[PDB]
Ligand SMILES: CCCCCCCCCCCCCCCCCC(=O)OC[C@H](COP(=O)(O)OCCN)OC(=O)CCCCCCCCCCCCCCCCC
Ligand SMILES: CCCCCCCCCCCC(=O)OC[C@H](COP(=O)(O)OCC[N+](C)(C)C)OC(=O)CCCCCCCCCCC
């Protein structure tokens with residue numbers, strides 16, 4: 001069922017500060033009546049030293065599955081898509097280009113693409129239409 | 133208002149404006165779907181080119 | 186009240202700023218570009234300021 | 247036309263934000279709707295003038311940096 | 312009734328008509344009337360029916376011409 | 392219906408369904424003011440807008456490029 | 461009436477444009493009719509003014525004298 | 535009126551003269567701001583050329599764009615401390 | 625005046641603890657590891673990167689001198 | 702619901718039937734001038750997409 005968030009210490013010794021079991025106030029029963037109904041807290045109830053990580057204003061904690069199991073599924077999902085992508089690449093099953101890619105006249109539109117002379121023709125031209 | 137125990141809900145009788153408007157809006161879509169099909173079904177499936185006529 | 190003490194004040198600043206802006210715009214056409222605040226004084230020029238700098242650097246040396 | 251299209255929605259936000267108390271709920275909603283509609287009509291006029299007539303509009307308020 | 316690729320436009324004619332760079336090819340000459348009629352027709356689907364079709368068929372010939380280039384190249388590589 | 396404490400809570404945006412008794416009078420005062428600003432924006436927009444594609448002839452651009460060489 | 465250093469440099473550039481090309485009749489005409497308030501608005505803007513030749517001369521001539529102050533080189 | 539820069543070089547003055555040193559620092563700074571003004575004018579030509587040319591901006595504004603990219607690395611404010619405190623010849 | 629805030633003893637003890645955490649800090653092995661990472665390891669990583677590429681990044685108006693697209697297409701057949 | 706809620710939906714409904722057909726040539730027409738969006742000549746695949754496609758792929762999303 002529920003479990004505490006990460007980085008919540010099991011023990012602490014802050015002098016004479018009371019030592020209480022760390023409780024996530026987000027998991028408390030909402031149908032009960034509290035002095036502070038919004039935060040699910042009664043007046044003068046002691047606070048954990050890291051209560052800011054275990055209250056309503058803390059990030060919402062998800063406890064449907066364990067993080068290791070949740071990360072196993074997350075890697076498995078993208079692992080399937082990775083194998084599916086690599087097989088088609090290594091196998092080379094993706095279709096070939098039906099025709100020669102588009103060609104353009106005037107030395108592959110070199111002058112219209114910022115070229116200055118014949119030295120910089122290949123630096124700016126597109127695929128040159130060799131068949132005039 | 134009074135609640136009648138054990139009475140099945142009959143066919144609702146909505147205001148006539150809602151029923152007529154809904155059918156006309158659907159009628160506009162279906163007519164437009166068929167109208168484009170009558171004139172673009174070759175080009176849609178690649179069976180013919182737009183200039184060919 | 187829609188013309189209360191708090192609603193009127195922001196509009197007053199806009200009207201005053203635009204009116205003075207146009208006044209300054211008209212004040213520069215007839216005064217060779219000089220602004221409305223020319224009565225307060227004039228910007229000091231390099232020639233007089235450098236004289237203070239020359240005397241200042243003389244005492245320091 | 248360009249200034250009317252852009253800053254008219256800002257007028258509706260200001261009117262409802264600071265004068266919404268003095269005009270009530272109903273008039274606040276419709277004045278905001280009015281301001282957006284002015285931007286709607288002005289945009290459609292520009293769409294014909296820009297896309298179909300190959301015209302561009304530029305307004306320079308002032309220098310920023 | 313376009314049957315062959317039309318004559319290539321000159322450099323200045325492409326410049327004056329401001330043809331898009333990606334569309335500066337054999338079909339540039341047929342593109343000028345189409346873009347001129349589209350402006351007067353507000354780019355409606357019922358104003359440039361034939362001018363659009365003539366330009367559409369020209370690019371079809373250009374595509375088929377590039378099929379020949381690939382097939383011809385595909386033989387030189389195997390022969391070599 | 393409910394209690395909203397409106398005697399002192401007076402936000403600029405109303406505070407729980409607020410409409411003054413003289414809402415009609417203020418609405419007209421706002422509509423006229425709102426109309427007086429759209430017209431002012433329109434006049435400013437027309438007089439300040441320009442076409443960036445027509446401020447220089449193409450012949451002028453040719454001279455700029457040749458000199459920049 | 462504050463002239464920032466960038467505003468001063470724009471006026472100086474146009475002043476040096478006159479002082480170097482006093483034989484160009486076209487240049488003087490645009491500069492004379494280029495008002496002081498429009499001096500710093502060279503380029504595309506809402507104001508209808510002739511400054512194409514003003515820009516053209518600047519594009520062709522380096523009117524800065526930074527090399528003159530640096531009389532020592534590597 | 536429009537006061538002009540008092541052209542003075544660090545190589546023709548004695549730094550013990552605080553007035554001459556002050557002019558050399560000012561003269562170098564004012565020449566650097568003229569370069570920035572020139573850069574902004576040249577960029578204005580590039581902006582105007584790009585808009586009117588449309589798809590022809592690569593060809594119509596080729597020389598202007600080349601000039602802007604060459605001047606950009608050095609048409610900026612560099613200060614006077616670098617040249618005042620360093621002798622390039624050595 | 626009227627003590628508008630209902631002071632809570634648990635909140636005060638929680639607040640006092642947060643403001644006085646330095647009293648109970650111990651320079652143990654756990655603390656030393658965190659001190660080393662934030663004050664030595666992390667600055668060293670930035671320290672190396674800052675001087676490795678110091679004066680070696682002339683990005684002002686950097687020019688392209690290599691074609692981007694491929695001229696000839698080689699079919700897989 | 703009331704007419705005020707309905708009114709925008711009907712206007713959007715009509716625009717959801719005829720809008721794309723009327724505006725297709727403005728944005729998807731071949732050679733249409735849209736210099737604001739730059740497409741390099743080597744990246745224009747509107748021809749190989751329109752003609753070279755097998756006829757099955759034209760209807761495959763519809764069938765699925
Ligand atoms: C809540 C607290 C209160 C704060 C809320 C109010 C904040 C208002 C902030 C205004 C700041 C002052 C800006 C206006 C000062 C005037 C600027 C100026 O000096 O003029 C520059 C411009 C042309 O420059 P020039 O030729 O040198 O004219 C000088 C003549 N003496 O001359 C002009 O064209 C004048 C233009 C005046 C424009 C009026 C202001 C319009 C609204 C701001 C426009 C900013 C752009 C829109 C921002 C909205 C977000 C997109
Ligand atoms: C370009 C920026 C332009 C911004 C101008 C827009 C108009 C401003 C309207 C202000 C009045 C208002 O809405 O804030 C006040 C309203 C009042 O609440 P109410 O709805 O009247 O009901 C009242 C019922 N209470 C009392 C339970 C709330 O809400 C609030 O207390 C919300 C608190 C945060 C307000 C954030 C203000 C906007 C921040 C903008 C950041 C740049």
Ligand SMILES: CCCCCCCCCCCC(=O)OC[C@H](COP(=O)(O)OCC[N+](C)(C)C)OC(=O)CCCCCCCCCCC
Nearest residue numbers: 191192193195257260261264265401402403421424425428
């Ligand atoms: C048709 C014309 C369209 C334009 C309309 C313009 C309206 C201008 C506003 C007039 C009303 C007014 O200034 O309201 C002032 C308001 C209202 O509260 P108050 O006045 O203090 O009253 C309460 C106090 N009491 C109880 C003592 C009387 O104060 C505020 O808290 C304003 C805080 C600033 C909010 C906006 C910040 C924006 C920052 C970014 C800016 C771009």
